Design a protein around this motif. Structure first.
Motif, PDB file in Angstrom:
ATOM      1  N   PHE A  10     -13.759  -0.252   2.343  1.00  0.00           N
ATOM      2  CA  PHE A  10     -12.266  -0.925   2.452  1.00  0.00           C
ATOM      3  C   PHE A  10     -11.364  -0.295   1.401  1.00  0.00           C
ATOM      4  O   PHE A  10     -10.388   0.391   1.788  1.00  0.00           O
ATOM      5  N   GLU A  11     -12.008  -0.134   0.260  1.00  0.00           N
ATOM      6  CA  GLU A  11     -11.080   0.430  -0.855  1.00  0.00           C
ATOM      7  C   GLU A  11     -10.882   1.780  -0.775  1.00  0.00           C
ATOM      8  O   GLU A  11     -10.308   2.471  -1.578  1.00  0.00           O
ATOM      9  N   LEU A  12     -11.539   2.443  -0.109  1.00  0.00           N
ATOM     10  CA  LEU A  12     -11.419   4.010   0.338  1.00  0.00           C
ATOM     11  C   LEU A  12     -10.237   4.508   0.393  1.00  0.00           C
ATOM     12  O   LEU A  12      -9.491   5.208   0.075  1.00  0.00           O
ATOM     13  N   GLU A  13      -9.743   3.745   1.420  1.00  0.00           N
ATOM     14  CA  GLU A  13      -7.942   4.036   1.884  1.00  0.00           C
ATOM     15  C   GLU A  13      -6.986   3.133   1.254  1.00  0.00           C
ATOM     16  O   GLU A  13      -5.974   3.439   1.305  1.00  0.00           O
ATOM     17  N   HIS A  14      -7.455   1.966   0.677  1.00  0.00           N
ATOM     18  CA  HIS A  14      -6.502   0.958   0.140  1.00  0.00           C
ATOM     19  C   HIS A  14      -6.866   0.550  -1.144  1.00  0.00           C
ATOM     20  O   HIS A  14      -7.711  -0.451  -1.593  1.00  0.00           O
ATOM     21  N   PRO A  15      -6.572   1.597  -2.245  1.00  0.00           N
ATOM     22  CA  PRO A  15      -6.934   1.350  -3.476  1.00  0.00           C
ATOM     23  C   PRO A  15      -6.449  -0.063  -4.239  1.00  0.00           C
ATOM     24  O   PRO A  15      -5.436  -0.061  -4.005  1.00  0.00           O
ATOM     25  N   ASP A  40      -5.311 -10.635  -4.968  1.00  0.00           N
ATOM     26  CA  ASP A  40      -5.650 -11.205  -3.570  1.00  0.00           C
ATOM     27  C   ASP A  40      -5.174 -10.312  -2.550  1.00  0.00           C
ATOM     28  O   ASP A  40      -3.970  -9.786  -2.371  1.00  0.00           O
ATOM     29  N   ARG A  41      -6.316  -9.800  -1.644  1.00  0.00           N
ATOM     30  CA  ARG A  41      -6.043  -8.683  -0.795  1.00  0.00           C
ATOM     31  C   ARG A  41      -6.870  -9.198   0.540  1.00  0.00           C
ATOM     32  O   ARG A  41      -7.274  -8.460   1.520  1.00  0.00           O
ATOM     33  N   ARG A  42      -6.904 -10.623   0.965  1.00  0.00           N
ATOM     34  CA  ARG A  42      -7.473 -11.053   1.719  1.00  0.00           C
ATOM     35  C   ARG A  42      -7.001 -10.637   3.442  1.00  0.00           C
ATOM     36  O   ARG A  42      -7.659 -10.249   4.152  1.00  0.00           O
ATOM     37  N   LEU A  43      -5.648 -10.798   3.241  1.00  0.00           N
ATOM     38  CA  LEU A  43      -4.755 -10.236   4.454  1.00  0.00           C
ATOM     39  C   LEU A  43      -5.390  -8.953   4.711  1.00  0.00           C
ATOM     40  O   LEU A  43      -6.038  -8.899   5.914  1.00  0.00           O
ATOM     41  N   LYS A  44      -4.899  -7.979   4.071  1.00  0.00           N
ATOM     42  CA  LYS A  44      -5.343  -6.485   4.291  1.00  0.00           C
ATOM     43  C   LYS A  44      -6.708  -6.273   4.668  1.00  0.00           C
ATOM     44  O   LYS A  44      -7.008  -5.857   5.709  1.00  0.00           O
ATOM     45  N   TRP A  45      -7.642  -6.953   3.805  1.00  0.00           N
ATOM     46  CA  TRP A  45      -9.053  -6.843   4.000  1.00  0.00           C
ATOM     47  C   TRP A  45      -9.496  -7.265   5.342  1.00  0.00           C
ATOM     48  O   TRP A  45     -10.253  -6.466   6.017  1.00  0.00           O
TER      49      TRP A  45
END
Length: 749
Positions: free
Chosen positions: A721-726, A733-738
């Motif tokens: 997931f963090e590959l495209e969204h560092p 807090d990144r629950r929405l994006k994740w």
DNA sequence: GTTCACCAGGGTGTCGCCCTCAAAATCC
DNA sequence: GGATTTTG
RNA sequence: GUUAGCUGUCUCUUCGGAGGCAGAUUUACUUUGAUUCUUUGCGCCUUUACGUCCCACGUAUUUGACGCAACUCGCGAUCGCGGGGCUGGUUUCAAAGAGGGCGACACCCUGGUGAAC
């Protein structure tokens, strides 16, 4: 499949890379065993040497502690003096200690100078650690101090004044700039007193039942000077029993005075306290003597009861003296008899409500019974260590700088070579490395081949490279060094001594770092002592790689299952799954329960339950690393974990193959991914549903599966997931994006 | 009969904070 | 020559 | 015993090299998990229960400790020096290990006082 097998398979692509980075070192210990079974005459010699070492250590620690207690700034200056900031014309702590305790010594040390110097060298690091720990602790202790102070002005004081309860005493002062142990202990005593006040006055009752009640915090973690706990002597079981005996007798000789002045109410209360093992049996006899003799004053009953109790103590202790203090049932009953005798003798004071006098009357009995009950447990084994500082030679000489050499008597046979250790502590013990034809005066030539060093100096200008030096060993004729035969096991010699790629006698991969004599003893008996030799070796391992993985492995820990795995591809779709050591938690719980029942029924556990848990933890780390490494080697896949022994073993194994970079100096934070090892935050991992994304049971869909396996798969699929969204600092807090990314992936694939 | 606070003693397991010599000059 | 001592 | 990458063989078969068997893989250390068979016993004292009520006296086939011998091992020269006997020894196995020092913390066990429920 083996850790070695998959390690070699991972080397097949760790040293198969092309990188310009420097090779990195690994420090490892061989940990031989001194063969005292076949060479027992070394036991008294080793014991005597370790005794001189301990005497000198204690003497030096006495002076060092007197100096720390005298003033602390001078001690801080001594321990942390550098070339910029010398202390008495000295540039390091160890230099100062060497002149003060050896050069400027008045009485001749009973220790030879090289062991004494190595002792001071180790002790310097001990002192430095103690001071650094004080430095780190003091800040948090000051935080607790300030928290307590601000609670004691507007929260606890306000609560007590608004609820009519009087305020107990105020907190003392810590003298923070020259922080000292005794002030901390005074403050902690006040903290304890007031925390007791708060629970009874408010949470137990008479005030609002708010669990908090503003109980003030303890100031925790301040370190002990070196050796404070190590050399704090405790009496034997017999002596503690004698102290308890005399205390109980002294309390029972004041009993008739307390029983001759009993009011009816106090007597009724004393009868209530003993209204129906030592306590209960005395209660039963109390009822028997009350019913059988209603025509007796309480004094006569107490006198008879205590006479009976102490007669039982008489027989118990007669048995103890005639059969040793190892019949722990007898010890438990005798301790309990003195305890109950004292309790019943002191009962009138307690029942009269004079608790202030009751506590200070009980203190001797309290301490004596605590001593006996603690000594019932088996004391921890005693461990000592004497270091050989190095293995280098005097330049152009082949002459040792220090007093220890690892030697090997290579045989003419394929499977009959021998290894030993040469140690010099007595006067006139000398060894040398010269070739057979290079004859020397006053020396004998031997069949040993010795492993020494050459180079490696830490001085910038003097820093020649370290190199394994080997050669034929000459020993002194009159006084030869002491020979320590070794016993190590093929798995070890196969690893450190005659490895296919790094045999000591033919290759140049390992370099000897130093040595350590070790003694392990049951306190109070040296004649059965275990002696080991620990040699620290260093070698280069391949430089770290630059891998382009299309497979990854996720692993989740912290459950009934220590580790569960889930292999994935570069897209993220599962390829396998499983669990590792699913019986570990159950077996661990069984061992814990056995330990607790042993603690109850007899006080402690005698033989191997002492170290079992730790052994199981080591075995679990080994098994988990094996499974993970085999999977990673199978799929050429970096492993993904969640933000301790298992982690450390995994990264050690991967760096030995050239697939992880060991810590840089400073750089206390680790890199999240370093070669195979990847690290991510365990947030929104074990909760999101596998089939949708929100034993494990989902609520939005009703799916049910194993919590550990789904957590592992989610961790593996979350690394992507963090590959495209560092991530960024300050944002957590990144629950929405994740969730959006996870559902987008689920829809697409 | 369990919960909490405090007091006394001991055990273990994990972590902090430490290290993993050489080399030159002088003295007996 | 071997031991002591200092030091980075 | 094994947890070395060797070697010799049998098949798979021609295809790629790939599965099984025998021995390797120098030492004999510190551990972990399965698995086979095996409970040393004769005194003196003591523990937890019942009577009795403590000392004592009885009695469970109750917890243990000392002594003597049966055994098992190491040790040195028929004998001596040491260790263990269920938290055991033993057969087959299949798998790990980088160590030392000194502290602190967390938990556990027992005892004690008080209170709340």
């Amino acid at each position: 499949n083996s850790i070695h097998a998959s390690l070699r398979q991972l080397l097949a692509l760790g040293l198969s890379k092309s990188s310009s980075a420097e090779p990195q070192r690994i420090t490892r210990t061989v940990k031989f065993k001194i063969n005292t079974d076949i060479r027992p005459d070394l036991i008294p010699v080793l014991n005597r040497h370790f005794d001189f070492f301990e005497k000198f250590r204690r003497k030096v620690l006495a002076e060092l502690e007197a100096l720390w207690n005298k003033d602390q700034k001078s001690f801080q200056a001594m321990v942390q003096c550098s070339a910029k900031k010398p202390y008495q014309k000295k540039t390091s702590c160890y230099a100062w200690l060497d002149t003060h305790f050896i050069t400027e010594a008045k009485e001749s040390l009973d220790l030879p100078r090289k062991p004494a110097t190595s002792l001071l060298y180790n002790l310097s690091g001990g002192l430095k650690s103690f001071l650094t720990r004080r430095e780190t602790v003091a800040e948090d202790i000051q935080k607790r101090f300030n928290d307590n102070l601000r609670e004691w002005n507007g929260d606890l004081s306000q609560l007590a004044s608004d609820l009519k309860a009087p305020l107990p005493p105020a907190p003392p002062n810590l003298d923070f700039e020259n922080l000292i142990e005794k002030a901390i202990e005074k403050y902690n005593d006040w903290v304890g007193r007031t925390r007791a006040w708060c629970n009874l006055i408010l949470v137990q009752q008479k005030k609002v039942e708010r669990r908090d009640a503003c109980l003030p915090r303890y100031l925790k973690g301040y370190p002990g000077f070196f050796g404070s706990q190590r050399y704090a002597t405790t009496a034997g079981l017999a002596e503690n029993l004698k102290k308890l005996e005399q205390v109980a007798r002294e309390q029972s000789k004041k009993m008739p005075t307390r029983f001759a002045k009993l009011t009816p109410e106090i007597w009724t209360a004393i009868q209530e306290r003993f209204s129906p093992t030592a306590h209960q049996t005395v209660c039963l006899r109390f009822a028997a003597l009350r019913a059988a003799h209603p025509e007796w004053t309480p004094v006569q009953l107490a006198e008879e009861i205590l006479a009976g109790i102490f007669r039982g103590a008489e027989k118990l202790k007669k048995h103890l003296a005639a059969n040793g203090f190892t019949d722990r049932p007898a010890v438990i009953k005798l301790a309990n008899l003195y305890n109950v005798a004292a309790a019943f003798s002191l009962d009138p004071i307690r029942a009269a409500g004079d608790y202030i006098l009751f506590y200070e009357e009980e203190t001797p009995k309290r301490n004596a019974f605590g001593d006996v009950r603690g000594g019932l447990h088996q004391p921890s084994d005693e461990s000592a260590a004497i270091e050989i500082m190095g293995f280098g030679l005097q330049k152009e000489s082949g002459k040792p700088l220090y007093n220890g050499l690892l030697v090997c008597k290579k045989s003419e046979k394929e499977h009959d070579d021998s290894w030993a250790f040469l140690y010099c502590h007595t006067e006139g013990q000398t060894f040398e490395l010269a070739n057979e034809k290079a004859k020397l005066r006053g020396k004998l030539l031997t069949d040993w081949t010795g492993f020494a060093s050459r180079g490696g100096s830490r001085k910038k200008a003097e820093a020649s490279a370290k190199q394994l030096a080997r050669g034929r060993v000459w020993i002194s004729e009159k006084t030869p060094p002491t020979v320590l035969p070794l016993a190590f096991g093929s798995r070890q010699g196969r690893e450190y001594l005659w490895h296919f790629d790094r045999d000591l006698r033919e290759k140049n991969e390992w370099v000897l770092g130093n040595g350590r004599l070790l003694r392990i003893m049951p306190p109070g008996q040296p004649n059965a002592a275990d002696f080991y030799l620990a040699i620290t070796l260093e070698r280069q391992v391949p430089p770290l790689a630059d891998i382009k993985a299309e497979r990854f492995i996720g692993i989740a820990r912290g459950e009934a299952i220590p580790a569960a795995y889930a292999v994935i591809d570069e897209l993220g779709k599962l390829l396998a799954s499983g669990k590792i050591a699913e019986s570990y938690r159950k077996q661990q719980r069984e061992f814990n329960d056995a330990k607790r029942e042993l603690q109850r029924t007899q006080g402690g556990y005698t033989r191997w339950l002492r170290s079992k848990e730790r052994n199981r933890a080591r075995a679990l780390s080994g098994e988990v690393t094996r499974a993970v490494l085999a999977l990673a080697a199978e799929h050429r896949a970096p492993v993904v974990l969640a933000n301790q022994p298992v982690q450390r073993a995994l990264e050690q194994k991967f760096l030995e193959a050239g697939l992880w970079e060991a810590p840089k100096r400073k750089q206390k934070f680790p890199k999240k991914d370093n070669g195979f090892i990847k690290l991510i935050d365990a947030w929104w991992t074990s909760r999101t549903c596998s089939q949708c994304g929100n034993n494990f049971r989902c609520l939005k869909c009703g799916y049910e599966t194993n919590a550990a396996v789904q957590a592992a798969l989610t961790i593996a699929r979350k690394y992507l997931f963090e590959l495209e969204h560092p991530p960024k600092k300050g944002e957590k807090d990144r629950r929405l994006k994740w969730q959006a990314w996870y559902q987008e992936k689920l829809r697409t694939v």
